[PDB]
Each structure stands twice: as C-alpha cells, then as structure tokens.
C-alpha cells in the first residue's frame, strides 16, 4: 500500500535522526568505557548482577534494523547503559564517573531531539 511505504518513510527517517543523536551520544565517552557489551569472559558473574545489559554497539545493531519505533525506546536503552554502570561500579572507580559525565553531557543531546521529534513528527 501507499500508506505502508509512507510509514516505511517516516521509520527511515527517524531512524537517520537517531543514528545522528547516538553518534553524539557516543562522543560523549571518548575513553569507549561503553562501546562494546561487558565482556563475559573478563566479567564472568556479569548476569547475575546486571539482568539487561547495554552498550552502544548492540544500540546500533538495533538502529541499522530499524528496530527503534520512537524516540522512548532508543532513551530506554543509552538509560540502561548508564543505570548499569552505576549499579555494578562503585562511586568512586573511572566507569562509575564516566556514565554520571555521559547523563550530564547527553541530556542537552536528548533535550533537543525530544524537540525535534515532536516538531518534524
């Protein structure tokens, strides 16, 4: 249908916003402490800590497929990016402060895309 390919549109083009917004997101951590899954193999006891992890790799394989609907879902998984990491670090280590720097640094990112979100629809 004509309906189906306009929507097919509008997915392709949020999800080129995104992936602009995660590539400003993803600058935000310049030492790459979240660009790839927490590896099990160094971490093996990882899952019983940690019940949904996040990095910004498996966000992008998601992205490629189209697999964000909206703006809230791709939030839900850069917050569990950070949440993760200040649940299993302690305050006071690099990783701990690395993701309370990346909320504050991507909350002016995620401010302005809620914005164009809504305006472009």
């Not at 917050?79 to 993701?99: E, G, P, Q």
């Amino acid at each position: 249908s004509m309906e189906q390919v306009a929507m097919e549109l509008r997915l392709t083009e949020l999800t080129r916003l995104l992936r602009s917004v995660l590539d400003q997101l993803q600058d935000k951590d310049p030492a790459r402490i979240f660009a790839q899954p927490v590896s099990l193999k160094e971490v093996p006891d990882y899952l019983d800590h940690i019940k949904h992890p996040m990095d910004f790799a498996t966000m992008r394989k998601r992205l490629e497929a189209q697999g964000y609907k909206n703006l809230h879902e791709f939030e839900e998984d850069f917050d569990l990016i950070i949440d993760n990491c200040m649940k299993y670090n302690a305050r006071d280590t690099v990783f701990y402060r690395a993701a309370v720097r990346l909320r504050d640094q991507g909350g002016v990112v995620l401010r302005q895309a809620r914005r164009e979100v809504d305006s472009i629809g």
